[PDB]
Amino acid sequence: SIEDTNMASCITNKKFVQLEKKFDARLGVYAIDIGSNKTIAYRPNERFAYASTYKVLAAAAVLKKNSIEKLNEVIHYSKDDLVTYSPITEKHLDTGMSLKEISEAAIRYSDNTAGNILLQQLGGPKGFEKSLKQIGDHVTKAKRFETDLNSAIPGDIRDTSTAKALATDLKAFTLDNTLTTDKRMILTDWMRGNATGDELIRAGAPIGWEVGDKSGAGSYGTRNDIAIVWPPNRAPIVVAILSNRFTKDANYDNALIAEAAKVVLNDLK
């Protein structure tokens, strides 16, 4: 069957090649079926800017590092801390917000000030990178805050990872024995049912399959989605799909991510 599997990989691979051509993009894919350890991989080790997908990993590291009581302490940030696109944190400027509330705002709405506060809580981008090293991720390189970290310049290693590294990290926090039971369930629920994921991996999932995701978007047409996918009566599937285009102001097309996800989920089916 070794001949049989590799021809299946060649066929799956050609679909990703055709998507890159159709959408004028570069695509990175890594998916693992937690029940069989089967994987799908396309440029799995090539670097992409992770953009807002880090927010779920930074929230997870904050959960791992901090007690329940600490995670409920109110953080009194100021108007000076608000960066572009802070729809939740800008509402609660008078009241302040807890690390738990900040984590939920970052994941559900991709609030950028929320993301910065999580990065700060971990010691800045370098401390966030150190938190990922502690779960065995020596690939991800974190350097800048929002919104500069979205610049996604060709060849630039700052604020980049790979589809394999991001998927493996997401698996580590949501499915492996890294967080306490309560923290793993809280983090997973934050990923469920958010409109920012509607046109991405969720749009490529078969009928009846639930998707919990964290989306990303940046310059050079960068458009990412990392997710846990729950098929009926099956073990979870962890999926990272990263992409970009080739000019600074290029427009992404969410359908590239959805069509890539259809390939992944139909071939892990």
Concatenate the DSSP letters of all residues of 115-160 into one string.
HHHHHHHTTHHHHHHHHHHHTT--S-B----TTGGG---TT--TTE
| Chain-centroid distance, C-alpha 164 | 11
Domains and CATH numbers, the chain: 1-269 (3.40.710.10)
Measured distance CA(91)–CA(95) in Å, rounded: 9
Measured distance CA(133)–CA(167) in Å, rounded: 14
Active-site amino acid positions: 52
Measured distance CA(137)–CA(83) in Å, rounded: 28
Instruction: Output phi, psi for 180, to 5 deg.
Output: -55, 160
- Contact between 66 and 58 (Cβ < 8 Å): no
DSSP, collapsed to helix, strand or coil, labels residue 215 as: strand
- Contact between 228 and 191 (Cβ < 8 Å): yes
